């Protein structure tokens, strides 16, 4: 019943008597699987989690410079040299300035000038490698039949509840058997390696903000970088050397690139961190479902004899199905809920179909709530639930260096 | 002699008027028949009384963020913070249903508000064409040793050097050059750079000269110059991002420092510096018409130097092929005319090439006095022969996206 309310909802109908049903589980998407003489199960990929990520390269986006010195040479006296050029913590640039009799040279021409400054990084971003094996897919199951409106959004106590179940799929464990109590069990044979190619993807971390970027883009970033776990390569990206009318050379740092990186990241898939593990809200997972051990809990129940009352007004979902929530005054439970659509109330010939297969009242106590989903025909019809004189009827009617987009 | 050593050096040969274009980092050597060689350079452009126009925020922070949501067909969502101009808000439509807290399935109204505050800002200033001052430096050839090429201290007392100040309200000047007479300067200050279409931008103690149309197109939150004290920011949405989260709340997050992005956008703009309240400029040209009428040759009446000369420095070739010669005079017959020339054959001493320094002279009546002259030699082998008679000195020479527009 967890798919009820989801706009990206897919209704799959497996072959009658057939064992397998192929499903595509997307994030923010939901699959309602239906089969003849089988209960309706709602299957959804809830979370994709990446573990044991390793540092590859770190880019500096905010830097600072200190201990800046210069060395100059007269024309034809060769290139200028500072002992700081042999220091890997320093950023240097050679230029040509006008030299002469007033400048301290016996020759007129362009003299070599070198300026060095000690580079230090204030704020940095980190790129992490993703191993395909250290990837976990969490699937949530929910069975139709019983359960009221309050169970559509409930993830506390699925271990004790037979109607709801949690499934964990990894490339090392791509198969699972989900115990559904009286409903039997659902088999899940999934393809985790063919969901989102993580060999060409990196995990980027900024000021507590995370993304999933293409590896080729990350290696093309125009910022100072250091390998894994520092010696900064391409320090020139955050350092500017200003030449002053061929007389002097000044060195100044280029401010925070945080904003420029944020705007470049527009197009990349956003992510979040769950301590050490990385949470993902994008990507699909192809699964083959085993219907073999899936059974109808309540097929032996007798029809509900007492009166029903609508707790909520029957509502149309985004896909045209009707959700009905009813209260049962009877104590003859567990019993089969009489539910159908009718165009003519004299014959009561059933029109349309039921999404909720075998709707049942489980409690033996009175005033118990229950929810069912119907697929009505196009045009006018009547949602007729219950039997005899006390039956309730409701009239219904249907109808640059920007990141590329992943 | 101030142009000696400058790579961007122009040699103009003028007649009463001589038209010159004075650029920053450039130098003009003006030469004329029966007139002294004058070196003219535009040293500083200064802008005064600049007024604030608009201030753009490049680093912001958000606080006190709240949300309000409504079920489908229950109308638009409202927060009391939407009526507060210190808050940035966005209305959206989210999926609502039986699991979300609604009895109806459809798009429900959701509103999110956050208190906007600016941490760091930049300021744009208007430039009035009248509040603009140009400073020109003059230096005459004839006397002066090597040490005078770079000297700006006592130009008031020195006849060879002079300071000229040109403004749109005073575009003309008469520069007293002592014995050399005077140089007239009729300049065009208003057609130097067109400051009516330019603004003065100030960041983290960094200054630029930007086009006014570009500055008004900046995608950043802005407040008017007149909005003193507590400021009202227009277009706060430029630094604030609204991400869709769920049916009851929508996440709001600030975009981070745009300082680096503004710096990279400013690549192309003319850089400037501040001198307290006045703005210093190191770019732009100034067109001047020079009056040669009152300019005279100090030393035309002097007799030729009879004593011996000594080279203080080795004659050096400038970037343009001219030779600079610095000599010491042992004689006391000064003031006298320095005998200077180039020769291919020492028997006849027929002068080859030409002199850049017109009428080289020794001014002091005392011995061991230093002096510097500039020569333009012919191509190939020649001799820098200075002095007269037996004591003359000879030296062998040889020639040859919101990017700023």
């Amino acid at each position, epitope marked *: 019943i967890r798919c009820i309310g989801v706009s990206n909802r897919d209704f799959v109908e497996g072959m009658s008597g057939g064992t397998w049903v192929d499903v595509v589980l997307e994030h923010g998407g939901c699959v309602t699987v239906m089969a003849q003489d089988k209960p309706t199960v709602d299957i959804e990929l809830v979370t994709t989690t990446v573990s044991n990520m390793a540092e590859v390269r770190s880019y500096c986006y905010e830097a600072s410079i200190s201990d800046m010195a*210069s*060395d*100059s040479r007269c024309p034809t006296q060769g290139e200028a*040299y500072l002992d700081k050029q042999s220091d890997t913590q320093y950023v240097c640039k050679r230029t040509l300035v006008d030299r002469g009799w007033g*400048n*301290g*040279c016996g020759l007129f021409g362009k003299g070599s000038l070198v300026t060095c400054a000690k580079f230090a990084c204030s704020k940095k971003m980190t790129g992490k490698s993703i191993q395909p094996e250290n990837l976990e897919y969490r699937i949530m199951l929910s069975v139709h039949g019983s359960q009221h409106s309050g169970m559509i959004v409930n993830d506390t106590g699925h271990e004790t509840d037979e109607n709801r179940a949690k499934v964990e799929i990894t490339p090392n464990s791509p198969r699972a058997e989900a115990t559904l109590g009286g409903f039997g069990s659902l088999g899940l044979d999934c393809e985790p390696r063919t969901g989102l190619d993580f060999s060409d993807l990196y995990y980027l971390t900024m000021n507590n903000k995370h993304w999933l970027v293409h590896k080729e883009w990350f290696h093309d970033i125009p910022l100072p970088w250091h390998a894994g776990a520092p010696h900064w390569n391409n320090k020139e990206a955050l350092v500017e050397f200003k030449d002053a009318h061929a007389k002097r050379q000044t060195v100044v740092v280029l401010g925070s690139q945080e904003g420029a990186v944020h705007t470049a990241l527009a197009g990349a898939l956003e992510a979040e961190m769950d301590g050490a593990k990385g949470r993902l809200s994008s990507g699909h997972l192809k699964c083959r479902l085993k219907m073999d051990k899936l059974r109808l809990k309540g097929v032996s129940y007798s029809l509900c004899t007492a009166a029903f009352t609508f707790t909520k007004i029957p509502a149309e979902t985004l896909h045209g199905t009707v959700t009905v929530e009813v209260q049962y005054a009877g104590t003859d439970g567990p019993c089969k809920v009489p539910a159908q659509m009718a165009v003519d109330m004299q014959t009561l010939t059933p029109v349309g179909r039921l999404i909720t297969a075998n709707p049942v009242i489980t409690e033996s106590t009175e005033n118990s709530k229950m929810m069912l989903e119907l697929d009505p025909p196009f045009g006018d019809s009547y949602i007729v639930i219950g039997v005899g004189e006390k039956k309730i009827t409701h009239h219904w009617h249907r109808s640059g260096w920007s990141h590329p987009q992943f | 002699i101030r142009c000696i050593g400058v790579s961007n050096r122009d040699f103009v040969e003028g007649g009463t008027w001589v038209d010159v274009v004075l650029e920053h980092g450039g130098c003009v050597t003006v030469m004329a028949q029966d007139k002294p060689t004058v070196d003219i350079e535009l040293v500083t452009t200064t802008v005064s009384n600049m007024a604030e126009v608009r201030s753009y925020c490049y680093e912001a922070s958000i606080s006190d963020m709240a949300s309000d949501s409504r079920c489908p067909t229950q109308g638009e969502a409202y927060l009391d913070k939407q009526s507060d101009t210190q808050y940035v808000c966005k209305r959206t439509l989210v999926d609502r249903g039986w699991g979300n807290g609604c009895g109806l399935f459809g798009k429900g109204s959701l509103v999110t508000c956050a208190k906007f505050a600016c941490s760091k800002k930049m300021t744009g200033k208007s430039i009035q064409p009248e509040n603009l001052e140009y400073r020109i430096m003059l230096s005459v050839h004839g006397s002066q040793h090597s040490g005078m090429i*770079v000297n700006d*201290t006592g130009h008031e007392t020195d006849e060879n050097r002079a300071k000229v100040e040109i403004t749109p309200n005073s575009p003309r000047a008469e520069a007293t050059l002592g014995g050399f007479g005077s140089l007239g300067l009729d300049c065009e200050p208003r057609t130097g750079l067109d400051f009516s279409d330019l603004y003065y931008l100030t960041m983290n103690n960094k200054h630029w000269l930007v086009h006014k149309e570009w500055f008004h197109d900046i995608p950043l939150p802005w407040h008017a110059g007149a909005d003193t004290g507590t400021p009202h920011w227009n277009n706060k949405e430029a630094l604030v991002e609204f991400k869709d989260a769920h049916a009851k709340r929508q996440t709001v997050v600030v975009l981070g420092s745009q300082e680096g992005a503004v710096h990279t956008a400013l690549a192309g703009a003319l850089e400037a510096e501040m001198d307290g309240a006045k703005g210093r400029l190191s770019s732009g040209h100034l067109k001047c018409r020079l009056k040669m009428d009152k300019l005279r040759l100090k030393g035309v009446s002097y007799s030729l130097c009879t004593a011996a000369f000594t080279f203080t420095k080795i004659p050096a070739e400038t970037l343009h092929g001219t030779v600079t010669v610095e000599v010491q005079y042992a004689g006391t017959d000064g003031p006298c005319k320095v005998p200077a020339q180039m020769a291919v054959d020492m028997q006849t001493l027929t002068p080859v090439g030409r002199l850049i320094t017109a009428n080289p002279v020794i001014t002091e009546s005392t011995e061991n006095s230093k002096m510097m002259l500039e020569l333009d030699p012919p191509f190939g082998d020649s001799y820098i022969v200075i002095g007269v008679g037996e004591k003359k000195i000879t030296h062998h020479w040889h020639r040859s996206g919101w990017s700023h527009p």
Partner: antibody
Amino acid sequence: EVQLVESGGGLVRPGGSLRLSCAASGFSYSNHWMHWVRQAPGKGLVWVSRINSDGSTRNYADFVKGRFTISRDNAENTLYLEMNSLTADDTAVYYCVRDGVRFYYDSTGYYPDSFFKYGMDVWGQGTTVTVSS
Amino acid sequence: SVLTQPVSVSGSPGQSITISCTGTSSNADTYNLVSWYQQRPGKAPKLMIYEGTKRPSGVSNRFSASKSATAASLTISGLQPEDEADYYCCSYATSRTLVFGGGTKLTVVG
């Protein structure tokens, strides 16, 4: 005429700090390199530091392992030597010195050319600094 | 570069004396850039020679200097009692730093 007058010398405790000052007059101060030289009692002259016209180049002897900072105020015709973490090894007469020769070659006093022609032609009388507990 | 000088030199009035300045980790440029300083008892040092052999104006013509690729030397001709002083040579230790020799005490005897 041309003179250099040092100040700020006196008794300082071991590990202490001191700021020496030098007043220059009779020459174009802003265009000259300035040096500090010291002489321990009964010992030889020891070069300490030099500074160019704008202060973009400040050089130090090996024994001044970042403990001293040379500086200048051109409009005030003043030279300074900020000294920290002083030891008995630093007890000496400190002389303020002008490089008059470099001015003849580079009248700007800016360019820090390697091994340039120099001459310490003007010396102050020196100020005594004693690093005594 | 480290500069070494004799500890002391003796001379009689009217005679000539030569003070050597030799370097370790030095080169021809070290000696090309040698400057010499005279320090009379209780007086501040005075520049006598710069650029290895150049004598500043005002300095007596009795002072001359020579240099080779291995040493620099100061020569005082026609020795006078006023020449009694400590003499120091100076040159570059590195491209950016200077160093003085240990000094030579010149005694004028008799």
